[PDB]
């Protein structure tokens, strides 16, 4: 499989990083109170809310305080793209200024959607290659171009025929 810019220990390191993930939950807006550690110790940043223009610098600074390796999960349509607030005071997506590894649609997403995002991030971490040391070898991060989730789940989604009618609970 393709990647984007002696071997078993790399899988060991990936397994250690994958099973041990410490989040920093950014409050921001109502995606946070749906879904419910200093940034120095946390390695995953969960942006859950509208990226307002007055606190885009706060998000950028608290992202810059984290240490490599670092991953970003964007919950909610606001953090994905701006959502419904295509308005003057709202940044249209947190991926305008920080790199995002997993996106979850929803307004808000369910907590189980965040669990699914955690599983997706865990697979992404497990299938990537990072430098072991900063003195030996290539000092480049190899992200894997994984198969998209909407094309992976296309067969069972298209195969759906009948649903329950909305007149009952």
């Amino acid at each position: 499989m393709d990647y984007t810019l002696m071997g078993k220990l790399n899988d060991m390191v990936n397994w250690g990083r994958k099973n041990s993930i410490w989040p920093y939950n950014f409050g921001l807006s109502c995606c946070y109170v749906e879904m419910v550690a200093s940034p120095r110790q946390a390695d995953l940043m969960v942006v859950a809310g509208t990226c307002f223009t007055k606190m885009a610098p706060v998000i950028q600074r608290l992202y810059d305080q984290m240490l490599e390796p670092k991953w970003v999960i964007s919950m909610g349509a606001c953090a994905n793209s701006g959502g419904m607030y295509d308005i003057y005071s709202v940044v249209q997506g947190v991926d305008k200024f920080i790199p995002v590894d997993v996106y979850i649609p929803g307004c808000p997403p369910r907590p189980e959607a965040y669990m699914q995002a955690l599983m997706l991030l865990q697979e992404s971490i497990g299938k990537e290659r990072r430098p072991l040391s900063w003195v030996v070898g290539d000092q480049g991060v190899y992200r894997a171009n994984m198969q998209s989730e909407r094309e992976r789940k296309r067969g069972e989604r298209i195969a759906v025929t009948n649903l329950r009618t909305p007149d009952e609970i």
């Binding site: 606190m55 610098p57 295509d86 003057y88």
Partner: protein, 571 residues
């Protein structure tokens, strides 16, 4: 004579009193559907009229609202004075159980009004926001700075020539804003905030980190001498979106203001749109709306009490609301003229299972609240204010009733058939501390369960949407079968329903106080002006005047005791 009929309220005694005091030619009475006497005052008589209303035999004691309107694009301005901008002042008399709206007309070249901070101190933040969003100066204001936008903001976003949509992002301006946020503590100037005596030299200035916002603190050791809360970090431009969505498609945005509220925030918007539309909704709509608003009020109160001191009760409410509307947090389910669907088959089983399982939890909550001596030592007596302080700062909801002032919207000014439900309004002593507010919220939880029992027990049979032609959208089976209904649905979901030109107003008792929607229609399919008064704004402005001489931990407890969210503050 329906409730939504356009009236001028010339039979109001305030109009006769103002005429006998200032003369008949001093003001212009406007006919609205706000339910309020709207009078247009000269700018030079404005402080005189405010002082006269403050000293009536049953005086107008509370400034409910103060904001601006851009009247330049308003075409249907018949019977109105010539204005390029206007400032409106909503004043509430509780003894009279009335309210009045004063309006001051302003030309484009002379945008300045005398300030009301000598009459009503909440006009401080109201006038700062009116300056920030419309560009109107208020002469005599102590510190007229921006409150929603950053101080280095170009233009006033609520003006009609300001584009609503998001401009191009720039890392350039982003790194400037980051570098001024890094150097803010080094270059803190304590008169760009309204502070004084900045470094005495024993005084220390800090910044503190229900939403995320900053509050600048001035300390004598550990005692708070002055504080200013920095808000606007959660500003979404919801009122501007009101000017850029159709009447129907603005409903989700009404949900996302005060996000713990859901249908409680949905309610005053559709009530004001139905006042604009001349719609009277049937009783089944009234009971469905009351039931959903009380379910969400119970959810919000449980979250507030759990935060102040759980997950199962709110989960049961969320499953019931998810079964009715299809969504937990932002149902988007109230409609103009009714509700989006009928109740699902099995709603009563879920509500009966929720109501048969709740009273023992309520007894547990009362045990954990009124028998907790650690909480009863930590909470009462701190950040306490009386009735006079709550009236002058626009405090509504649990704080106002905890001061002994028996004012609830659901009883004084009933809406959506709340007079058909038997429920009590808890009022406390004369002291509004953390403890009395928490027990008032517990008693309101009990009363909301009573209202839910009455919603379940005698639920009307009938339509869930009105027979009115302006009901948006029309019933879906007639839309899918009948051509005139298909036509009405077509033009109501595409161009939008046409509300004839009028001004409407609805205030309701939200989960955190009084929430009101003031809607101005220019005869089009969008709102000309959407003014949203939220209680968390007025409650946050009272924070400096309530903890003068307290400690920082006392400030933290006060912040916990106030039911507020930043989306409600900033909208």
């Amino acid at each position: 004579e329906p409730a939504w009929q356009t009236r001028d309220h010339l039979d109001d005694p305030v109009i006769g009193e103002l005429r006998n005091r200032f003369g008949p030619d001093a003001f212009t009475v406007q006919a609205t559907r706000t339910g309020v006497p709207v009078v247009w005052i000269k700018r030079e008589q404005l402080l005189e009229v405010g002082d006269f209303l403050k000293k009536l035999p049953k005086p107008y004691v509370m400034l409910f609202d103060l904001h601006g309107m851009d009247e330049r694009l308003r075409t249907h301005r018949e019977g109105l004075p010539a204005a390029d901008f206007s400032v409106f002042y909503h004043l509430i008399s509780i003894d009279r159980n009335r309210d009045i709206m004063l309006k001051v007309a302003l030309a484009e070249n002379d945008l300045h009004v005398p300030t009301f901070t000598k009459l009503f101190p909440n006009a401080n933040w109201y006038e700062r926001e009116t300056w920030d969003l419309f560009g109107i100066t208020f002469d005599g204001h102590p510190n007229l700075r921006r409150i929603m936008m950053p101080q280095t903001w170009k233009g006033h976003p609520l003006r009609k020539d300001y584009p609503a949509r998001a401009t191009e992002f720039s890392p350039f301006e982003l790194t400037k804003a980051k570098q001024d946020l890094e150097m803010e503590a080094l270059t803190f100037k304590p008169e760009e905030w309204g502070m004084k005596r900045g470094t005495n030299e024993d005084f220390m200035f800090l910044n503190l980190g229900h939403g995320a916002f900053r509050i600048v603190l001035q300390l004598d050791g550990e005692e708070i001498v002055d504080c200013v809360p920095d808000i606007g970090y959660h500003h979404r431009g919801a009122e501007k979106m009101g000017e850029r969505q159709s009447w129907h498609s603005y409903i989700p945005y009404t949900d996302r203001i005060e996000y713990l509220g859901g249908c409680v925030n949905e309610m005053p918007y559709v009530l004001a749109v139905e006042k604009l539309a001349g719609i009277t909704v049937p009783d089944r709509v009234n009971v469905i709306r009351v039931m959903l608003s009380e379910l969400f009020r119970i959810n919000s109160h449980l979250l507030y009490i759990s935060t102040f001191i759980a997950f199962t009760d709110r989960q049961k409410i969320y499953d019931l609301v998810e079964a009715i509307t299809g969504f937990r947090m932002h149902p988007a389910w109230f409609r103009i003229g009714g509700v989006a669907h009928d109740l699902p088959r099995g709603w009563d089983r879920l509500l009966r299972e929720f109501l048969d399982w709740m009273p023992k939890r309520l007894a547990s909550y009362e045990k954990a609240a009124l028998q907790n001596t650690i909480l009863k030592g930590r909470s009462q007596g701190v950040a306490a204010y009386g009735a006079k302080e709550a009236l002058e700062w626009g405090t509504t909801g649990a704080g106002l009733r905890a001061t002994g002032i028996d004012f609830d919207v659901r009883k004084a000014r009933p809406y959506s058939g709340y007079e058909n439900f038997d429920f009590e309004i808890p009022v406390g002593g004369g002291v509004s501390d953390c403890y009395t507010r928490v027990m008032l919220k517990v008693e309101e939880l009990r009363q909301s369960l009573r209202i839910l029992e009455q919603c379940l027990n005698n639920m009307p049979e009938g339509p869930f949407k009105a027979d009115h032609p302006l009901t948006t959208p029309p019933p879906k089976e007639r839309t899918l079968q009948h051509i005139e209904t298909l036509i009405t649905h077509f033009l109501q979901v595409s161009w939008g329903p046409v509300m004839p030109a009028n001004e409407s107003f609805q205030m309701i008792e939200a989960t955190k106080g009084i929430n009101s929607y003031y809607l101005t229609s220019d005869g089009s399919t969008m709102s000309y002006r959407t003014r949203i008064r939220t209680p968390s704004y007025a409650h946050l402005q009272q924070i400096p005047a309530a903890i003068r001489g307290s400690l920082v931990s006392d400030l933290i407890v006060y912040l916990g005791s106030i039911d507020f969210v930043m989306s409600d503050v900033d909208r």
